Amino acid sequence: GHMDTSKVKVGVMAGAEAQVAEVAAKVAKEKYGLDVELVTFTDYVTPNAALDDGSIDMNAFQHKPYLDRQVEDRDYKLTIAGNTFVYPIAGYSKQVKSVAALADGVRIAVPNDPTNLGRSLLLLEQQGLIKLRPEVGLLATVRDIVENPKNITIMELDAAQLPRSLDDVALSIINTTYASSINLTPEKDGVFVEDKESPYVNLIVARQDNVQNENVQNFVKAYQTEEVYTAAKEIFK
Numbered sequence: 221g222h223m224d225t226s227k228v229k230v231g232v233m234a235g236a237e238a239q240v241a242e243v244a245a246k247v248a249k250e251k252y253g254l255d256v257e258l259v260t261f262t263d264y265v266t267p268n269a270a271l272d273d274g275s276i277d278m279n280a281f282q283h284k285p286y287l288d289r290q291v292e293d294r295d296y297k298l299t300i301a302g303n304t305f306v307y308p309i310a311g312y313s314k315q316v317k318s319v320a321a322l323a324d325g326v327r328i329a330v331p332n333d334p335t336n337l338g339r340s341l342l343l344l345e346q347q348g349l350i351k352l353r354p355e356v357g358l359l360a361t362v363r364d365i366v367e368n369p370k371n372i373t374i375m376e377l378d379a380a381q382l383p384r385s386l387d388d389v390a391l392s393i394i395n396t397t398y399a400s401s402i403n404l405t406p407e408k409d410g411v412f413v414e415d416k417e418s419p420y421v422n423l424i425v426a427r428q429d430n431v432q433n434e435n436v437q438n439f440v441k442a443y444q445t446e447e448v449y450t451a452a453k454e455i456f457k
């Protein structure tokens with residue numbers, strides 16, 4: 221028009237997650253008269269940078285381990301505003317339906333950022349594919365492997381490249397953020413799935429100096445409404 225409405229920029233991930241954010245934005249307008257503008261991203265390392273730089277007022281795409289790690293490596297100054305959902309990561313495959321009877325020497329693809337790499341290795345261990353040292357935490361790496369019976373080779377790739385990895389490796393642990401973009405769900409296609417209970421619940425994060433504002437708080441509330449939840453269930457099969 222000739223003048224625009226006052227809006228708040230929320231950063232989210234393209235695809236399934238943006239669809240969920242769309243409903244939240246819908247609920248935010250009806251309940252709080254909060255006009256929201258979704259800003260979709262395709263890479264995990266961008267959202268916090270945008271938030272910190274002032275390009276967006278908040279984002280919804282990460283879990284605490286990831287945020288803490290990124291704040292430590294770049295010094296962003298952010299504060300958690302509220303929890304969203306948990307997306308139990310899963311291992312998928314266009315070749316096998318089970319982990320037992322996985323040929324020896326196979327390649328297994330996993331994300332390469334530190335917190336999701338560690339998460340994947342922990343998950344593999346739960347499958348009995350490998351064993352990690354006793355004191356390893358949430359940041360395990362290949363240097364922490366103390367047992368590898370099937371002689372597996374861990375291929376670390378950028379999270380957004382894991383979908384396409386299914387065509388080159390025996391099995392890939394993919395964030396639902398991307399697995400959904402190729403119509404895969406843990407419940408329907410997962411060879412194995414991470415437990416619901418874990419430290420990976422997603423969050424709505426804002427800057428340290430704006431987290432108190434009702435704009436941030438209200439969006440958080442809208443995202444936790446029954447409506448959005450219902451829409452989310454649908455969106456993820």
Ligand code: MET
Binds near residue numbers: 281309397
């Ligand atoms: C940047 S960490 C992102 C986590 C991802 N959405 C998951 O829940 O698997």
